[PDB]
Structures are given as C-alpha cells and as structure tokens.
Paper text:
Int contains 3 functional domains: an arm-binding domain (AB), a core DNA binding domain (CB), and a catalytic domain (CAT).
We obtained crystals of Int82N bound to a 44 bp double-stranded DNA (dsDNA) oligonucleotide mimicking the CI. The DNA (named CI5) represents a sequence from previous in vivo studies in Clostridium and contains the conserved left and right 11 bp long AT-rich imperfect inverted repeats (IRL and IRR) that mark the ends of Tn1549, connected by a 5 bp homoduplex crossover region (atagc) (Domingo et al., 2005) as in the transposon integration substrate in the recipient cell. Each protein molecule covers one IR and the crossover region is located at the center between the two subunits. The CB and CAT domains form a clamp around the DNA and the two protein subunits face each other in a near-perfect 2-fold symmetric assembly. The CI5 DNA molecule assumes a nearly straight conformation and the double helix is unwound and largely distorted at the crossover region. Distortion is initiated precisely at the boundary of the IR sequence, where R153 from the Int CB domain, invades the DNA and flips out the first base of the crossover region into an extra-helical position. At both IRs, the R153 sidechain stacks with the terminal adenine base of the respective IR (A5′/A5 in IRL/IRR) and disrupts the continuity of base stacking. These include the catalytic triad K225 (natively R), H344, and R347, as well as H370.
Numbering used by the authors:
A (entry chain A), B (entry chain B): 81 to 396
The structure:
Amino acid sequence: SMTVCQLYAKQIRHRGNVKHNTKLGRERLMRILEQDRLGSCPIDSVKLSDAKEWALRMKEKGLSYKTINNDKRSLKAAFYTAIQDDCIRKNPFDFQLSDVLDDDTEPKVPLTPAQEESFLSFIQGDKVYQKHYDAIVILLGTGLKISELCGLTDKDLDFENRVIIVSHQLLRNTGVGYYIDEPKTQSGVRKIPMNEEVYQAFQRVIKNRKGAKPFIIDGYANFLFLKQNGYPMTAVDYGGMFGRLVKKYNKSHEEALPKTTTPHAMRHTFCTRLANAGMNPKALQYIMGHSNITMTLNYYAHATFDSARAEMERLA
Amino acid sequence: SMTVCQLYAKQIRHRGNVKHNTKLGRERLMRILEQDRLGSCPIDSVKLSDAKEWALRMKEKGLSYKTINNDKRSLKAAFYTAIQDDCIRKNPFDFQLSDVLDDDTEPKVPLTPAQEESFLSFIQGDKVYQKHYDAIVILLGTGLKISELCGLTDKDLDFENRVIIVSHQLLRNTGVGYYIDEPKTQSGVRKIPMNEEVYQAFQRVIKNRKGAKPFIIDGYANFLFLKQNGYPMTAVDYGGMFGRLVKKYNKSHEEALPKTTTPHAMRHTFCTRLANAGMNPKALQYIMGHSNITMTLNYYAHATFDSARAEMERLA
DNA sequence: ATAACCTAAAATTTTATAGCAAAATTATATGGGATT
DNA sequence: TCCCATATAATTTTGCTATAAAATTTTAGGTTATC
C-alpha cells in the first residue's frame, strides 16, 4: 500500500465482490497507473498538484473527460481508505476536475420524431437490415437497454396482457462467454406495457425465428433475438450493426443522423419523447428503470419563465 | 475543544458566516448541551452508546423527532471536524436515528378544493379577518413563502405584465428587528405570473392601503401588507392570525380544517394542486423557487405499474 | 470488388445520493386592549 | 372570551454534491457473403 499501484491494488482486495465488467475496468485503470509516473509514487508524498498533473497527462494521453473523472473517483476512494487507516492525512484527489480540464464532451442528442420515422422506413425497406426492424421498433417503444433486449425470452412475454417482464439481462465477455445477470432486489424488476407496434414486432420475431441452436443458461432458453450462428445477440453485436446501419443511412439520405445514434440512443429517444409529451415523471421512471427520480428528470427540458407562464395558464 | 460544549462552540466559531436565525438555533442547541450530562463530557470519552442514551433523553424531554435528528447532525459535524484535526478516530453520531426512536411525524394533509372555497368564503364574510382575504388568495394562487409575501413592495409588482418579481424577503427577530434577506446569485430570483384572482387581489391591497408609517430599509419601501401599527407584516404576525382564524373557522363549520392549516399550508396546497393536474415538474420547480428538483418531485404521487400503464396507453 | 459479421481488445458512457445543519416557519407564555 | 403584539421557545422546511461500479460503444484484425 506504499505506492499508488499498491494502494489501488489493496483497494480492489478490500472491495472485491464486483461483477466481471468491473474487474475489466479496474485492470484498465491498473494498466494506466503502471504506465504512468504516479503509479510508483509513495502515497505519503502525493500532493494535491501531483493528482492534478495526473489528470493533465490523462487528457494528453487521449482519454475522454468522463474517463479521467471516473478514474479520479476510483483513486479518491483508494486514498480515502488510506486516510481511514491513518496511512496519510489529506486526500490529494479532493478537487474539481472542471478547474483543471474543460469538459469537451459532445452532448447526446435524441432523435426527433421526423428522424425516428425516416429511420424505421429505411430499415424496413433495406434488404440487409430489415431483420433488425422489429428490435429497433421494440427499443424505440420500450426504452429497454441493449442487454435487457438480448435477455428477453418467450417466458418473459405476456401476450395475454401485452406486458414485458424485465427481470434480467444477457451479457457476454471474452473468456467467460454468455452469462445471466439478475438484480439483487425486486426493485430492479419492472413491467413494460406493449403498444400496437411493439406487440406486432414481438409476434413477427417469434413467427420468423429459425435456426436456434441449443442454448440454456441459468434456466433461460428460447431467446427472441439471435445472431446468424443461431446464438443470442449481444450488446457488441448490436453496436457494430448500428455503426454499419447509420453509415449506410447517411449515404442514402441528404441529412445525416446524429453521430451518437447507438442502441442506447433509442432509450434516450424513448425517454425524451415521452417526457416532451407531458408524461408523469414517476411513471416514466418506472418504465425506464432508474433508481432515483432525479435521473429521469434529466430528460425534461429546462424550464424558463415563459414556459411556466403558459403552463400555469394551461391549468388555470 | 476537549469537551462537547467546547467542541460545538469551536464549530460555531469556524463557520461564522451564518444568519441570525442560525445563531438562534445554534444557541438553542448550546443550551441543550449545557443542560445535559453529555455536554460536559470529554470528546475522547464519548462512545456510540453515549449518543443513543442522549437521544433517548431528548425524546423524554418532549422534543420532536425532526428536532432531535437535526441536533444530532450538528453534533455529528462537530465530531467530524474533530476527527480531521483533534485526536479522534470514530464518530459516535454515525448512526440512524430511526433505530433508536420511532418517527411520530403527522402527515401534512393539504386542503381539498371544497375546503379552500369554504375557507375563503368564511374569511370574506368575517368582519375580523376579511382584511386578510386578499393576502390568502395570493398565497393560494402563487405559492409564495410567508416572508416572501411580507417583502413585496410596489416596485416588486409588474401590473403591465402581471408578474410577481420575487427577489428578496422581509424578516424580523427580537433585537435586530426588520431586516431584508437577499439571495447570493440570481438563481434565487423568480418571476410568478398573476391570474385573474391574484391580479384583482393585489389591486384591492394597494387601493385599500392606509396608515403606512415611514419605513425604509435597504432601499425597500412601500410594503403592501401592513399591521395595524402601520409597519409591515411578519411571519409571526400571519402565523398567529392563522391560528386564531382556523380556530374560529372550526367553531362554525362541521368538517374542521387540518391542525396544520398554516401560511405554509397555502404553499403546500398550491404546489400539490398543480402536480396532480399534470404540470411540468421543472416548470413547477421554477414557480416554487426550489434549489434542487427532488423537493418538487415529492409532491408527485408514487407511481405503480397500473398508473404507469395508463400513462403509456394515454400517450400511445 | 466492398461491405458485412465476428471477436478480442480498448475505450467511453451510463448509472447512482443521503444528510458530515443552515434557516426558515410555527407554537406558546404574557400582557395590554378591544369585544360578546 | 377574543385580538393583537412580542419575547421566547419549539418545530418544520430547506439545500449540495458522487470517497466508481457496471454497464455500452468503438476499434483493430480477420473471414465470409453480396453488390
């Protein structure tokens, strides 16, 4: 625990009950510390300027603002543990990154209703990506995360009541392969109603499903969305497909789609479209699956005096 | 700072830039420590068990649950600074008060629309409180805090646009007397529109204003709402008037008003009535002048799967 | 002749917060004054 | 008894920022299917 690499390594051991993607993210930061001059510095000599100069080298290395901010929080928790053990006194990472680096992050812009209909029309007619038409319709109409969509099976659907039961996700990583992840409490389980377009999409998925290879993981089988090899789709498989789909859309249309048109942009467009329509915020929170209500309110536009004037006159 | 009273006294001297009401509240807690055995104990001799026995003595003293929880927080921050500087390792106040004592908080039930009409009808038809009719109509139609209403002057009204510019408040305390409080940044300044009832209420206030004694403070003059002595109203003057008004109302009406029918209850009724009507939460946050949006979302009812399904089908 | 899929690897984004008191509002004891 | 004002006391309302996990997306290198 003397050096920063030894301090962060001891932090991983103290808090080890983590998921697989967390282990990959921690090792990513460990490789950063080992390749950086800060990794070999004794923790009792890391000053406030040393931590700020680390963020400068991270931005010069090429890392985005949110990455340096997330890695700083990981390092701040490590030094906070050393303060509890009286190894040091002050935390060198107790500063604002905005005072050292400028947040040059492109804001994620959702799809307008005009772009949303032009996008689905191109997908339905294209002979290469029409097989993904139903999934993108379901994503735009439910706000499901990409791994939640990949984890949907026949037992997760209630066609008698037109309700989607979101209770798990289907993840895949190098080495471990597929694995099912479920929330610890029932708060992570939510039910989403299906509209007419979403209902017709699920029926066309089941009626046109073929070539499914044997695949049972944690009692889950008969997945709805499969790859060309008969095995269920994953987040990486959808992300790569969206890259080729948007690039092909831009070549056939004069106005190009936003550069951030990813599977999560369907979730961002879903929450924004319902928020602009005046949906109940806590009801929209349940459909989205957010832990707190402040996270859902980020999708509501900033209110001014003129907007609140006509809004109060609307309910007078 | 070796004893609890000396530690909390050093905590007051550290963060001195406070308001007069804060100095009264800190003195109210200092008298609590001086009149309790846990005030003269050394900081290195107080464990977590001594904090639980102290909270039980405050509950036996008759203090409210929120009162003890707020005072236990001031003591928690007093020992938090002690751990950073003085010889201290563990904080004896790092515990949840709900485990020691129960919460006897009474729910603040808002006013139903039928009660408000009957409440405003009694005020108009009463020869003693009819002079306060226009003030209460404004509170229910704008949601102003009671000290934001007392600070309203002629220059704060824009009858050309029917806008209430809320930029300050008028407070009074024993010794200091009247004093104007202004926010630090422009975020604390809000603009509230006037409806037909609020507009006609402000017109009757100015047209019937008489007996205003000379009163200029921090450039503010010509206050709208005055006492019978010619000086502007305060929160205590409206609070005591409401207590006598509600008591007289319950003598003549069968369905008695809630025990918490206070000037703030008018603000609570204003916010809850707009949230139930489907108002934009960020537009409601601006009219209320809240810092964060979590407080505004508390007025929205908890959503279930049935309520969320109805909202999705309403916007499908 | 070019995408179109697949996967290990690398990068980025999404997700997630009470409470480490200030500072307001309201109730009460008290007394002089106006009503029933 | 009720109104009013006020010092005192009690109670309620209010305010700021994440002491990272765990997802999703992009990319380099390669093979395979369709323009």
